[PDB]
Design a protein around this ligand. Structure first.
Ligand code: HEM
Ligand code: HEM
Lengths: 210, 206
C-alpha cells in the first residue's frame, strides 16, 4: 500500500470535518495504551507524541513500528501499544469511525497505509527469525574479511565481495544469502556502494550483529 | 478490519464495472504466480481456484494464508504465491487499480480486508515460531540436565527453575513444556520430577 499523508484529507473540503466530534485523550509517558486481554476497543488517531507497537517473547521485545502525528490505529490488533512520550489522540468507537469512513472514503487510505506498515513490520520480524543464523554468519564473514583505509581523510571499513562470492564462501544458497544480507543492509549494519563493494558503518554494531 | 463481501460492491451500480478492463490469466496447478523476486507489478483478484502465500527461509517453507474467489492481492508483497489448483485471476497494473478504487471507494474495503488477513496470519506465524523455539530450549535443557540412573534417566527441576535457567517466564515455559509432554517426549511425575522416555527423540528436538 502507498503511504498516507493525512493532511491531504484534512485540508480537503470533504475530509476537513472528519474528526469533528471525536473525543480527545492524553497518555503519559511509559503508559500502556492497550495490550492483549484488552477489554477495551475502538479507533484513534495520534495528534502529537509517539507510541510504540510491539509484541514480546524469547526474553526479547520485538518493536514492530511507531505511531506519530497523523497515524491511525485500533484497540483490538492484539498488539501492545505504549507511549514513549506524552501523546494526544482523538478517539471514537468502531461504528462512529466506520460511518465517518463511508462518508469520507479518502480517509480510508490512512487505514490501508497503517495496515501495510503493520504487515511489513511483521514480515520483517518473521524474516529475522527464519534467517537469524545466516545473518550472524554473514555478520561474521564481514567482520573476518573487513579491511580499513588510512584515517587521514579517511577511515573506512570495506568488504569487497559479490553476493555469489559470499554465498559460495559461507555455504548457504545464493538467494538465501541475498535476503540475509539485504536484511542486514536494512538494519544499517552494512552499506552497499555498488555491486561487489560494501562498507561497514561502525564496526562495533556489526560485531554486535553476530 | 471487518470481513468484506465483494458481491456487495459488484452487484451495485457503482461497483458493477469495477473490473471491466482487467485482463484474464489462468494459472496451472503447481504454478508459481509470485516469485520472491518477480520485479513486475500489479494487482489481481481471484476468480476461482486457490493460491498459497508463503515465505521461504533457510531451506524450509511456511504457509501464511490462501486466496480464493473474491480475494484481491498484489505482485509486490514479497511473499511467494503458488496456485494449489487451476486458478483464474483478473489482473491489471497498480495505476489502473488505484484509478478504479478512486471512482469506487467501496471496493477499498476488499483491500483493507486482505491486509488485515495477512497481518493476522503473520502475527500467528510469529507466535508459532517463538513457541517452537522455546520448546527446543526446554528440550535442550532436559538434555544437559539429565540424571541417568536406576535405567531411569530424569530431570529434577520445578517449572520455575527450568524457566529461569531457560531465560523465560514460568508461564511461557509451562505451556511449551506441557506441550512437550502431551506429545510424549517428557513425563511429569510430580513437581520437580520429570523422566525422559527416549533420549534420542528429545535430543532430536533440540
Ligand atoms: C492488493 C494488496 C496489497 C498488498 C497485500 C500489498 C502489500 C505490500 C507490502 C507487503 C509492501 C511492503 C513491501 C516490502 O516488503 O518491502 C507494500 C509496499 C508498497 N505498496 Fe502495496 N500492497 C497491496 C496493494 C497496493 C496498492 C493498491 C498500491 C498502490 C495504490 C500499493 C503500493 C505500494 C507502494 C507504493 C509500496 C512501497 C512504498 C511504501 O509504501 O513504503 N500496494 N505493499
Ligand atoms: C485502525 C487499524 C486497525 C487495525 C490495526 C486492525 C487490526 C485488526 C486485527 C489484527 C484483527 C484480528 C484480531 C485477532 O483475531 O487477533 C482485527 C479484527 C477485526 N477488526 Fe480491525 N483493525 C483496525 C481497524 C478496524 C476498524 C476501523 C474496524 C471497523 C471498520 C475494524 C473491525 C474489525 C472486526 C469486526 C474484526 C473481526 C474481523 C475478523 O475476524 O476478520 N477494525 N482488526
Amino acid at each position: 500500500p502507498p503511504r498516507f499523508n493525512i493532511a491531504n484529507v484534512l485540508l480537503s473540503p470533504d475530509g476537513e470535518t472528519f474528526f469533528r466530534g471525536f473525543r480527545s485523550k492524553i497518555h503519559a509517558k511509559g503508559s500502556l495504551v492497550c495490550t492483549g486481554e484488552g477489554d477495551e476497543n475502538g479507533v484513534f488517531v495520534v495528534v502529537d507524541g509517539r507510541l510504540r507497537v510491539y509484541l514480546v517473547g524469547e526474553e526479547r521485545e520485538i518493536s514492530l513500528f511507531y505511531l506519530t502525528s497523523g497515524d491511525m490505529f485500533c484497540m483490538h490488533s492484539g498488539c501492545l501499544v505504549e507511549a514513549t512520550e506524552r501523546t494526544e489522540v482523538r478517539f471514537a468507537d468502531i461504528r462512529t469511525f466506520e460511518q465517518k469512513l463511508q462518508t469520507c472514503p479518502s480517509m480510508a487510505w490512512g487505514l490501508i497505509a497503517i495496515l501495510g506498515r503493520a504487515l511489513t513490520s511483521c514480515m520483517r520480524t518473521i524474516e529475522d527469525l527464519m534467517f537469524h543464523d545466516i545473518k550472524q554468519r554473514i555478520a561474521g564473514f564481514f567482520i573476518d574479511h573487513a579491511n580499513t583505509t588510512g584515517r587521514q581523510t579517511g577511515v573506512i571499513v570495506s568488504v569487497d565481495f559479490t553476493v555469489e562470492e559470499i554465498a559460495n564462501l559461507i555455504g548457504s544458497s545464493r538467494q538465501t544469502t541475498s535476503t540475509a544480507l539485504n536484511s542486514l543492509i536494512k538494519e544499517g549494519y552494512i552499506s552497499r556502494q555498488g555491486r561487489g563493494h560494501y562498507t561497514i558503518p561502525n564496526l562495533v554494531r556489526l560485531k554486535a550483529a553476530a
